[PDB]
Design an enzyme around this catalytic site. Structure first.
Site, PDB file in Angstrom:
ATOM      1  N   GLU A 104       0.865  -1.204   0.000  1.00  0.00           N
ATOM      2  CA  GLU A 104       0.000   0.000   0.000  1.00  0.00           C
ATOM      3  C   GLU A 104       0.887   1.236   0.000  1.00  0.00           C
ATOM      4  OE1 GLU A 104      -3.145  -0.802   3.054  1.00  0.00           O
ATOM      5  OE2 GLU A 104      -4.203  -1.159   1.144  1.00  0.00           O
ATOM      6  N   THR A 196      -6.771   2.286   5.614  1.00  0.00           N
ATOM      7  CA  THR A 196      -6.661   2.117   4.156  1.00  0.00           C
ATOM      8  C   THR A 196      -7.803   1.321   3.555  1.00  0.00           C
ATOM      9  OG1 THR A 196      -5.363   0.086   4.177  1.00  0.00           O
ATOM     10  CG2 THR A 196      -4.173   2.217   4.338  1.00  0.00           C
TER      11      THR A 196
HETATM   12  N1  LIG Z   1      -5.365  -1.392   6.574  1.00  0.00           N
HETATM   13  S1  LIG Z   1      -5.299  -0.584   7.998  1.00  0.00           S
HETATM   14  O1  LIG Z   1      -4.226  -1.089   8.810  1.00  0.00           O
HETATM   15  O2  LIG Z   1      -5.301   0.825   7.713  1.00  0.00           O
HETATM   16  C1  LIG Z   1      -6.731  -0.935   8.828  1.00  0.00           C
HETATM   17  C2  LIG Z   1      -6.727  -1.209  10.213  1.00  0.00           C
HETATM   18  C3  LIG Z   1      -7.892  -1.450  10.923  1.00  0.00           C
HETATM   19  C4  LIG Z   1      -9.120  -1.396  10.277  1.00  0.00           C
HETATM   20  C5  LIG Z   1     -10.311  -1.655  11.135  1.00  0.00           C
HETATM   21  C6  LIG Z   1     -11.621  -2.146  10.520  1.00  0.00           C
HETATM   22  N2  LIG Z   1     -12.569  -1.998  11.621  1.00  0.00           N
HETATM   23  C7  LIG Z   1     -13.417  -0.911  11.728  1.00  0.00           C
HETATM   24  O3  LIG Z   1     -13.573  -0.151  10.721  1.00  0.00           O
HETATM   25  N3  LIG Z   1     -14.125  -0.647  12.926  1.00  0.00           N
HETATM   26  C8  LIG Z   1     -15.246   0.226  13.054  1.00  0.00           C
HETATM   27  C9  LIG Z   1     -15.639   1.163  12.054  1.00  0.00           C
HETATM   28  C10 LIG Z   1     -16.766   1.964  12.195  1.00  0.00           C
HETATM   29  C11 LIG Z   1     -17.552   1.842  13.346  1.00  0.00           C
HETATM   30 CL1  LIG Z   1     -18.932   2.843  13.482  1.00  0.00          CL
HETATM   31  C12 LIG Z   1     -17.201   0.913  14.358  1.00  0.00           C
HETATM   32  C13 LIG Z   1     -16.065   0.105  14.213  1.00  0.00           C
HETATM   33  C14 LIG Z   1      -9.203  -1.078   8.926  1.00  0.00           C
HETATM   34  C15 LIG Z   1      -8.006  -0.846   8.229  1.00  0.00           C
HETATM   35 ZN   LIG Z   2      -4.000  -2.773   6.338  1.00  0.00          ZN
END
Ligand SMILES: NS(=O)(=O)c1ccc(CCNC(=O)Nc2ccc(Cl)cc2)cc1
Ligand SMILES: [Zn+2]
Length: 258
Positions: A104, A196
């Site tokens: 990425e 991301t």
């Molecule tokens: N590729 S990275 O390392 O950037 C990356 C790390 C962690 C995530 C977590 C996905 N999880 C999440 O989106 N949780 C969430 C979202 C909205 C609400 Cl309202 C409640 C909980 C996504 C990308």
């Molecule tokens: Zn990631």
């Protein structure tokens, strides 16, 4: 018609459901090594994974997550650019269909074969869902993968992948030590950014290590046998699950090293 990594639902489409996709602090970015400024005020990173407790591995339809018990202060990231303590919750990778793409972040436009993300949340916000709503809520440690010698510490992950081939499958995955995925040097670049993947929240201090780890071709080939689809659906290989570099806008990337 949910988001993913295809012509019809891939990164160029995400802004329609997640308008923050065109925001001011989106990730990933290209790291221009010549313009990243050494910041002698940055501290050495403190990666304390001796007590990390892995629980489970999950194919979520976009990648696989190795999940940790984050109910105590067991695996934490501190120091570097960070104020306070960030607890490890999960790691996952992004990778390509071929060795020439998959990461990425890029380094002077170089794409690596894959990129590991060790995701940590700021314990001042009490849990992960609250932390992602804050500009300093997460710290993600990014580590590039190149193809060469095998990474022995990765093989336990590689060998469980057959058992979580399709979306929604999980498997017990205890006693995995993520110290086995770290390169020798903790020299890093850092900048403020985002998740991301949707919901693309602008809640991440990114810490990207300069030194890649080496994995074998056979190791990454096994990543590419996973499926985006659920069991019994048309097979769509889980490859090219990376978002391309986004505009840097008004941000500075800082180097921990001369
Ligand atoms: N590729 S990275 O390392 O950037 C990356 C790390 C962690 C995530 C977590 C996905 N999880 C999440 O989106 N949780 C969430 C979202 C909205 C609400 Cl309202 C409640 C909980 C996504 C990308
Ligand atoms: Zn990631």
């Amino acid at each position: 018609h949910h988001w993913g990594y295809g012509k019809h639902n891939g990164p160029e489409h995400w802004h329609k459901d997640f308008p923050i996709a065109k925001g001011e602090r989106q990730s990933p970015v290209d790291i221009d090594t010549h313009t990243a400024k050494y910041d002698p005020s940055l501290k050495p990173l403190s990666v304390s994974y001796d007590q990390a407790t892995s629980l489970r591995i999950l194919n979520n339809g976009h990648a696989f997550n190795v999940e940790f018990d984050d109910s105590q202060d067991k695996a934490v990231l501190k120091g570097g650019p960070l104020d306070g303590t960030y607890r490890l919750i999960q790691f996952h990778f992004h990778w390509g269909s071929l060795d020439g793409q998959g990461s990425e972040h890029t380094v002077d436009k170089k794409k690596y074969a894959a990129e590991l993300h060790l995701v940590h949340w700021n314990t001042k916000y009490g849990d992960f869902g609250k932390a992602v709503q804050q500009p300093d809520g997460l710290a993600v440690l990014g580590i590039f993968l190149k193809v060469g010698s095998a990474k022995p510490g990765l093989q336990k992950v590689v060998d469980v992948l057959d058992s979580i081939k399709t979306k929604g499958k999980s498997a017990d995955f205890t006693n995995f030590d993520p110290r086995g995925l770290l390169p020798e040097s903790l020299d890093y670049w850092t900048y403020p950014g985002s998740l991301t993947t949707p919901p693309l929240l602008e809640c991440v201090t990114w810490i990207v290590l300069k030194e890649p780890i080496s994995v074998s071709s056979e190791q990454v080939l096994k990543f590419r046998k996973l499926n985006f689809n659920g069991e019994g659906e048309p097979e769509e290989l889980m490859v090219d699950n990376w978002r391309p570099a986004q505009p840097l806008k008004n941000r500075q990337i800082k180097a921990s090293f001369k």
